[PDB]
Design a protein around this ligand. Sequence first.
Ligand SMILES: N#C[C@@H](O[C@@H]1O[C@H](CO)[C@@H](O)[C@H](O)[C@H]1O)c1ccc(O)cc1
Ligand SMILES: N#C[C@@H](O[C@@H]1O[C@H](CO)[C@@H](O)[C@H](O)[C@H]1O)c1ccc(O)cc1
Lengths: 490, 492
Amino acid sequence: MLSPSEIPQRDWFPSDFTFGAATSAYQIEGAWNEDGKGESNWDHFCHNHPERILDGSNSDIGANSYHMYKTDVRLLKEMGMDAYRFSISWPRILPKGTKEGGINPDGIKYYRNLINLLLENGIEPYVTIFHWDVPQALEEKYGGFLDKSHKSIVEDYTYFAKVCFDNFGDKVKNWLTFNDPQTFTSFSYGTGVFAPGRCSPGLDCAYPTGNSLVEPYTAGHNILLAHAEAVDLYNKHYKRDDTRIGLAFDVMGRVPYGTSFLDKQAEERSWDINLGWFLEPVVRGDYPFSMRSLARERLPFFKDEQKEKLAGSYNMLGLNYYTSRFSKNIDISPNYSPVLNTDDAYASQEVNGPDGKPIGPPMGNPWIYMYPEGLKDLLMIMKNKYGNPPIYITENGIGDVDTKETPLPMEAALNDYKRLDYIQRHIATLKESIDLGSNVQGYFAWSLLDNFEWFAGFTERYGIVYVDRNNNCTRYMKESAKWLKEFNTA
Amino acid sequence: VQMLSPSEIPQRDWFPSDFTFGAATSAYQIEGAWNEDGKGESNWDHFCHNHPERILDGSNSDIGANSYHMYKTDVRLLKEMGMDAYRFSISWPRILPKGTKEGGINPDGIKYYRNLINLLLENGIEPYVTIFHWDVPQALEEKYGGFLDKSHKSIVEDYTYFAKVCFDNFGDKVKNWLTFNDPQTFTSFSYGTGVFAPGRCSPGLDCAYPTGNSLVEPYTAGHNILLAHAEAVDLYNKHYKRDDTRIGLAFDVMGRVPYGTSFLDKQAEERSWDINLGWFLEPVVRGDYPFSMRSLARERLPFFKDEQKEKLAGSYNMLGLNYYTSRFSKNIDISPNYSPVLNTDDAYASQEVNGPDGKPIGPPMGNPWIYMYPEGLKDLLMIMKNKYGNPPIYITENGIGDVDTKETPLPMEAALNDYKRLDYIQRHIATLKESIDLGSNVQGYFAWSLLDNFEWFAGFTERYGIVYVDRNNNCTRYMKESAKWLKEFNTA
Ligand SMILES: N#C[C@@H](O[C@@H]1O[C@H](CO)[C@@H](O)[C@H](O)[C@H]1O)c1ccc(O)cc1
Ligand SMILES: N#C[C@@H](O[C@@H]1O[C@H](CO)[C@@H](O)[C@H](O)[C@H]1O)c1ccc(O)cc1
């Protein structure tokens, strides 16, 4: 729907700006139990609770990228992508998740080959160390990130990072410790829609014996400690002048529902519980004041030493942006009691504004509404409030619904103009944000490939590249990929 | 000393013709005749009489400025200065000796305020009447602790009746009512730090009665004040309001400026405006306390019933703002190492006179706490304008206290040449013009303290008047340079 002069041009951005595509291990790799790979929390969840996956599927094969990585690289190369962000499977590297469990040589070999091939083709690898795939051995031993000691998971995650640094550090110049920590903690232990599927008694999830008001925070605390530790290790023994490390946050833009100053306050609390939760700790060493005043004793305290390691523990930050919501105020009162950790923001997140209209056009699936302006707001907040650090939009895209009840014909799947329009608009927003002073340095189209979508299973295709699972996971560029190719190679 | 240049000095024609300039006072501070003509004992009579040690110079206001007997001269000074209005308060115990209906109305009390009001009006001076200015009848204090009334009922009904008496006897003449004045200072100082009557505070704290709870009582009192206000305004709107009459309340407020550039201090600043101004402003504006306060004080801050929120929301036609100075708000993180002691600590922010550069926010005006920072007044007005509906505003108090102690007496000559005060007054008046140009709905300015009088725990160690009171003589009044300039300004 954009005019020719509105369609982003590569020369709109600096020569050193980077464009790429991204993926996550469990979503695309497959070979879930091959070549020594250990079982992950997701293998476990999908295998034991198909009823918790919309289409009862699993990612035993995913996009088969473990075996087809060479093709994934060819595709990235043909599109002229400057970089590729992928994650490393913790259990594929450490089957038992620990040092004593030993390192899986085949796991190391796979990522080593992928990294070299990428670099061989002039593509920069942005390596995400962890993308929700916790080794089931750690889950069973101490609950994974639910580790009440704030020690075991931290040490185990740190060793995992070490193994990644030791084996790929000479080639990798860009590391991301965690990806979407907020969604991980909230969905895995709040609503329990993600593995292992825990939530408060009374709530509907596989294991309603957790605490949706506490476990998400415990896990979040351990993630931050893990991040801080991994970064301290990186800086002390692996960082080089031109290498960088950080983490990527999942974030929905927030806009005051109404004009009342109350909604502005609600909006502020929403940015805090969504973005600040993990951003403020790495920026200043502690959680947002709002969260501490609201979650109170349910939000763990950091030791002074931990605050120090946390503050400034990054050289760049990733932002995973898809949509935004209107934040509507909720007063503290005897009539309201938070149920989910996310309810601690005392604000309902609305899709429709007070005028009954969606914040932005629906992109197809249950939650993505196109609102590029939210990305700008986000970038302006990063610029003006959090020190304008180097930013990478590590994820941005939409999911095309493709269900058994309503299959998406391959032809229609390839003509993803809605996705194309969406991507172009957000890329344009970056150009605008850059001129406004934003220190954004890159954009990664989310999902190089159509793959497993967690609890949504295979009901959505997020790739810019189509994967025909019925035919040996053959990949085909969608219109979006073709435009990105043109854009990059112009 | 560094005063405004001729072109900078405010002129009356800078403001609309309907803008109002006046002076203010409070009953216990100037009246005197503490036990004359049937007047009942107040919490302050009690406090000063029983705890002289809690008053800096050990004085009391048994006489004050002897305004009960000299009100005529007070009105003369107001007239001579060409003031448009006069804000004074009514002594609850002087009107209702027992503080209750069954206790009866004191004829002499009624007569006094009636004569004062009539003399003001026959002189073309508009009376802005403050129903309550901290002087709670001791009978109510002994009966149920006054505003500490744990049932949130008795004090509400007694205040409401008091208000009724005032509306009944002076409503025909008074067109501007203020239910309360400085509720924040009253609750915080009377039950937080305990420097105000009755002098209560948490055990371990230094006050006459360290058996209270500095983290709860100030809130209880504040809650009762808000309910009292809501009930009185409801009574007023229903039976006494006329198209040309207005009612509201005045808040004591210090401007807040972020200590540093960190966003944390901006948050601290916001929390500080909330606990100082929002505490009582938000309830009358939207019907409930600031979110920050509810999130921080939690259960120590009472909840309003739905019917109460309804009565509170919009319970005013105008608001008074008592502004003197400002502070830099410095963030304090929530942590196990920090526990609030005073209700005001709930804002999680230190209030600093000096900024990161070690310099005061503004020039010191003399007493222990006033620093000249009129820009703070502008900030405050912009907040009322942009955040709270831009309601009609009256700077119901503004001035400084000239120190005058036994050890360091202030010679009458020096007391009369109050150029520090004059400069301060002129600058704030100028700030109002600037604020008006920025769209502020401010409609008046009241120089705080028509007269030198009793200054609560500071006793007579400070002269806040624009008019000097020679207590050695028979409280004879003499216009200070500030008063003389106001006269010139008003009558130009
Ligand atoms: N995960 C998550 C949330 O983030 C995005 O969810 C997409 C859905 O599969 C995923 O493809 C993308 O990589 C994630 O960044 C999320 C938000 C809302 C709902 O309903 C589910 C997940
Ligand atoms: N804040 C404060 C003080 O309460 C204002 O004080 C004025 C001085 O006369 C009074 O006229 C006005 O009504 C009040 O709003 C204060 C007094 C003493 C000390 O030690 C601290 C603060």
